[PDB]
Structure formats: C-alpha cells, structure tokens
A paper describes a structure:
Autolysins are peptidoglycan-degrading enzymes that generally reorganize the cell wall during cell division but kill bacteria by bacteriolysis when applied from outside the bacterial cell. We surveyed the genome of C. difficile strain 630 and identified two virtually identical autolysin genes, cdCwlT33800 and cdCwlT, with a lysozyme-like domain and endopeptidase domain.
The structure of CdCwlT33800CD2 was successfully elucidated and refined to an Rcryst of 0.184 (Rfree of 0.215) with a good chemical geometry using 1.45 Å resolution data. There are two molecules, Mol-A and Mol-B, in an asymmetric unit, related by non-crystallographic twofold symmetry. The structures of the two molecules are almost identical within root-mean-square deviations of the main-chain atoms of 0.42 Å, and the structural description here concentrates on Mol-A, giving a relatively clear electron density to the whole polypeptide chain. CdCwlT33800CD2 was spherical with five helices and eight β-strands. A large β-sheet comprising six antiparallel β-strands (B3, B4, B5, B6, B7, and B8) was noted at the center of the molecule. An α-bundle-like structure with three helices (H1, H2, and H3) and a small β-sheet formed by B1 and B2 were located on one side of a large β-sheet, while two helices (H4 and H5) were present on the opposite side. A large substrate-binding groove was detected at the center of the molecule, and a large β-sheet formed the bottom of the groove. The electron density of the B4–B5 loop of Mol-A was poor, while that of Mol-B was invisible in the final electron density map, suggesting that the B4–B5 loop was in dynamic motion.
Residue numbers in the entry: 212 to 334
Amino acid sequence: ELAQKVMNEALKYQGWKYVYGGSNPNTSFDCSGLTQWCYGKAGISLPRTAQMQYDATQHLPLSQAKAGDLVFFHSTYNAGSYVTHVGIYVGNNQMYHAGDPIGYTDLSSSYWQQHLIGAGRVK
C-alpha cells in the first residue's frame, strides 16, 4: 500500500526540474525533498536530508528491497556526509528519484551498483 501511495504522489512530478533545497510542489524538489514530500503524503514523516533519512530507516540489500523502500548512495558529489543521494525503490531494479529531470532510473547499471549503500525500510 505504501508504495502505491508514495508513487501516486511522486508521479505528479515526472519530468520536472531538480531544484536544490526543494521540498514541495511549489518549488520542485531535490532528492530528499522529493522523498520527504511523497512519504509525507502517504502518512510517513521523514527528516530532510538524505543522510538523516538513511539513519531513520532499517537497512537491507537491494536484493531484498520492496517497492516503497528507499535506496541510498555514497560518493555521488563532494559532501561531508557519507550518504549523498536517496531515491525510491519501485521494484525490478528501478528507482524513482530527483534526479534531473525527476523520474525513473535503472539500478542495475554499474554506476548505481558502485555508489550503492543499500536500501532502507521506513518505520
């Protein structure tokens, strides 16, 4: 149920431009702004940053992940925190994320595999 609620919201922003600092439809979204907003619509309260969201979830490999789990990554840009990116797992090795434009990407790629930290299940 969670996945369908989060993604019904997230799909409204498919193709939108990434905006740094964005956390609502009025501004558009950054990676963890998209997840915070969409999970919020589904009744889950998440913290604002990708790192904070990582630390609020229970972790599991991508092979065990289910749609509606989050997926986290390291070393995607020059950051103080270990976690540098988050997106939404939607099954079949795909994630939906911001992302520029916002939308789907395939996690099977070497790039995502090598930046992967793991998946996280929300509380």
